[PDB]
């Protein structure tokens, strides 16, 4: 499978689904991180908060 490791739980759902993270940066969808089946990896892009600093 192109998605990857397809496996079912006791509920018959999907396991280890990779997720994409988007930030609304000036009304444009900019990728800011990726999600593994168990861990989150931010990308090289920065994320701006509604206020000031990126922290």
């Amino acid at each position, epitope marked *: 499978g192109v998605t990857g490791r397809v496996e079912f739980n006791e509920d018959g759902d999907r396991k280890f689904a990779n997720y994409s993270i988007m930030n609304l*940066q*000036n*009304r*444009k*969808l*900019v*990728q800011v991180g990726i999600y593994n089946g168990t861990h989150v990896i931010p990308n090289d*892009r920065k994320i*701006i908060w509604p206020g000031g600093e990126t922290e």
Partner: antibody
Amino acid sequence: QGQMQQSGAELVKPGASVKLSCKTSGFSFSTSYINWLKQKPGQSLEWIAWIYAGTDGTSYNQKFTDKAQLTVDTSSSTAYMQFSSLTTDDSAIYYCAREGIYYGNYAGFTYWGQGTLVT
Amino acid sequence: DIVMTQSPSSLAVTAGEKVTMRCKSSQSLLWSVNQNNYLSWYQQKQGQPPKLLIYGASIRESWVPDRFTGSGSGTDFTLTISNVHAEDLAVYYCQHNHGSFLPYTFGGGTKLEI
């Protein structure tokens, strides 16, 4: 290299509707932005609307918010613009273009269709 | 819509000379937080899709030769060619890229003649 191919020329009666197609290829169809522009002959292009294929987010020009509708087909990677209540003012050339974004920053329309004339 | 003012409207020069084309926006295209100008210079030749020439009012594209020089900041911007060639003959447009300043608008344009 990405390619955008538009539909052929249309002769539409006034007050009727036309739905134009714009097949896209050579790039990530889901993660890009496509814009429809109205260009009358001898005139500059008029921005109509933009749509994001990954989220179905739609934004139209106020002049065309009640006139044009946009749809996409992920299986075919083809953009669609349906122009309804057509009038003689709509006798113009419509173009579909793919946005060029560098380092996450928009840098202008880098790809274009061949153009479609609606009479 | 931010009004983009381009000057001159058209010009004709001999090969080898230096030209200057100005772009003026009705509003400041500079965002204070990042101090970047949302201005893009383009080269549009007859019968072809426009080719992105300079973005950020100062940065040339990879395919753009060093002879092109974009300057200006805030509301006023300038496109300058140090060594004008015959191939450069085209109509050049400056367009704002500020997402908070939608919709995107274009200036009047400058026609280059040789």
